[PDB]
């Protein structure tokens, strides 16, 4: 059950956030800044998992863009990194050569991809063509 997702870029700035648990908006700004500070203060052969406070915090850098999760401590761990990868494949198959810019500018649609893929914490569509078909048909509804 993924607690949150933080697409943040290399310089520290946050490009996306999606909290599946409701903690108050001071704790969002403190948790987000301390997690951006932990992940950007980490070397590159460092196993892509952080035991951050009862949350096996996953991250898998793709460009200047990072990613993040927080799987609960009873689930699978590698599949959450693969969930990050499937979400990058969805952001690519919707856009077509996905970028850092097209997540900056089309973030309104980045949430809609994330909401055609992960709702409430868990995965809803394990395929990768039904998800992009559903969002491009909900956008073909215009």
């Amino acid at each position: 059950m993924i607690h949150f997702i933080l697409l943040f870029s290399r310089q520290g700035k946050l490009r996306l956030q999606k909290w599946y648990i409701t903690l108050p908006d001071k704790e969002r700004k403190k948790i987000t800044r301390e997690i951006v500070q932990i992940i950007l203060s980490r070397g590159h052969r460092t196993s892509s998992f952080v035991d951050w406070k009862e949350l096996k915090l996953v991250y898998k850098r793709y460009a200047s863009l990072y990613f993040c999760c927080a799987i609960e401590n009873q689930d699978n761990e590698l599949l959450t990194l693969e969930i990050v990868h499937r979400y990058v494949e969805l952001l690519d198959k919707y856009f077509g050569n996905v970028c850092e810019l097209d997540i900056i500018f089309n973030f309104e649609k980045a949430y809609f991809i994330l909401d055609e893929f992960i709702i409430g914490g868990e995965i809803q569509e394990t395929s990768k063509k039904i998800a992009v078909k559903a969002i491009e048909d909900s956008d073909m509804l215009q």
Partner: peptide, 10 residues
């Protein structure tokens, strides 16, 4: 720049 590079290269 560091931004225009695509993510997973297919």
């Amino acid at each position: 720049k560091g931004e225009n590079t695509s993510l997973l290269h297919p």
